Design a protein around this ligand. Structure first.
Ligand code: HEM
Ligand SMILES: O=C1N[C@@H](Cc2ccc(O)cc2)C(=O)N[C@H]1Cc1ccc(O)cc1
Ligand code: HPA
Length: 389
């Protein structure tokens, strides 16, 4: 019996990945059977076929990867936002081209980096950079006060838990976070919450409750902040384990857009599978998947498939097909925020590398503490030091 996940240690690809058949039976954190899918070919096939349903992964009594920390219907969040007529408002808010946002992200990154320079080495670049940068950007696009980020952010280490059991803290924090966004609809003039407040009580939006409106602010803050802060921390882990490549990118800032594609391809921040329930009997490679069975898509399996990414462990900023990675998923549930995610990372990484020469890990790499029982692989602290000039 093979247990999934394999390890919370994000310093390199788990040894198990190179040994997997493209489709393997595993036992999940919740005790269920699942088909783990790890070849580039079959990851593509699952993500691009809607008979492998994300929505149905929260149906009553279905095999689970781990306990829900949200209402079951919120697994279909993007579908619900569309059905409620709120897709236009959401796509506008997550567009990095929104007026002033690029200049705001550049000034905020510059400001956080200057605070790290005034503090001096060593610093925890997660709590002084990746977290505050990701949090404040999400307050900015939601339209809410930046001083709300600490309190909403406090929910995140529990909200994205991968637990064998129901987490009582998840419901307490959800209700608190929903109440907070509900209050913001009454006093917010700008960004997404401002937009939603203008739609509320107008023709065509009679079917949208206050709770449904609030659920858009809570879910986009949570999914955006955990994925952006999670990626940027683990992009810094990649660069800190390849300091010659990190030095090269600091001297060639014109590489940054290509660099972010290769950092996404090589990233180890995904600590679980992308879940899909088989809505009918289906052949997947050499495996017969029965209706009702859970399928776990492993993006790191596809992204380190040597038949698509030759020498997959090599960090090659100029890899021609970097952007063919599955770190934003694929098919119908493809991440709607790729433009923002890529731009946020480019600005954040440029600010760090321009100002912190010869950036290095300030502790032995095997002295990092890895978060366990969590959707993302993440070091609890990321202490860094840097040269002078
Ligand atoms: C580097 C940043 C990011 C990464 C690596 C990332 C990754 C992903 C992935 C892998 C999925 C697919 C889940 C699945 O197929 O089951 C996804 C979906 C999603 N992401 Fe992102 N994401 C990022 C940034 C963001 C941001 C900034 C937001 C929102 C502000 C966001 C909102 C969403 C939403 C709502 C979905 C669900 C889409 C659907 O069901 O159709 N993501 N993301
Ligand atoms: O299950 C969901 N839940 C929410 C995300 C979410 C999960 C928990 C939470 O407390 C807040 C948001 C969603 O938008 N769609 C789906 C899929 C998902 C999961 C994680 C993630 O980062 C992005 C998407
Ligand atoms: O890391 C992740 N795991 C599962 N689903 C996700 N949706 C966005 N990011 C993730």
């Amino acid at each position: 019996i093979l247990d999934f996940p394999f390890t919370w240690d994000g310093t390199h690809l788990p040894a198990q990945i190179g040994e997997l058949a493209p489709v393997v039976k595993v036992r999940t954190i919740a005790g269920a059977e699942a088909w783990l899918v790890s070849s580039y070919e079959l990851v593509k096939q699952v993500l691009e076929d809607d008979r492998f349903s994300l929505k149905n992964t929260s149906d009553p009594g279905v095999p689970r990867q781990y306990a829900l920390t949200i209402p079951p219907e919120v697994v279909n969040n993007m579908g619900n936002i569309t059905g409620a007529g709120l897709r236009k408002a959401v796509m506008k808010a997550i567009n990095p081209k929104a007026p002033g946002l690029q200049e705001w992200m550049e000034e905020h990154a510059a400001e956080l980096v200057e605070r790290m320079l005034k503090h001096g080495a060593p610093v925890d670049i997660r709590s002084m950079f990746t977290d505050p940068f990701s949090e404040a950007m999400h307050c900015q696009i939601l339209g809410i006060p930046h001083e709300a980020a600490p309190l909403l952010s406090e929910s995140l280490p529990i909200a994205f838990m991968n637990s064998p059991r129901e987490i009582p803290a998840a419901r307490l924090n959800w209700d608190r976070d929903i109440a907070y966004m509900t209050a913001r609809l009454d006093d917010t003039e700008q960004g997404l919450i401002g937009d939603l407040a203008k739609l509320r009580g107008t023709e065509g939006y009679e079917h949208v409750s206050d709770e449904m409106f609030a659920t858009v602010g809570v879910t986009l803050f949570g999914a955006g902040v955990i994925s952006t802060a999670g990626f940027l921390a683990m992009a810094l882990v990649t660069l800190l384990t390849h300091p010659e490549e990190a030095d090269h990118l600091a001297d060639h800032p014109e590489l940054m857009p290509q660099a972010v594609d290769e950092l996404l391809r090589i990233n180890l921040s995904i600590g679980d599978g992308l879940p899909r329930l088989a809505m009918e009997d289906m052949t997947l490679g050499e495996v017969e998947v029965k209706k009702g069975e859970l399928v776990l898509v492993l993006p790191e399996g596809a992204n380190f498939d040597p038949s698509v990414f030759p020498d997959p462990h090599r960090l090659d900023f100029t890899r021609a097909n970097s952007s063919a990675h599955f770190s934003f998923g694929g098919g119908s549930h493809y991440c709607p925020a790729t433009a923002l995610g890529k731009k946020h990372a480019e600005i954040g990484l440029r600010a760090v590398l321009a100002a912190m020469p010869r950036l290095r890990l300030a502790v032995p790499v095997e002295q990092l503490v890895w978060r366990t029982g969590f959707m993302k692989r993440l070091p609890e602290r990321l202490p860094v030091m840097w040269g002078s000039g």
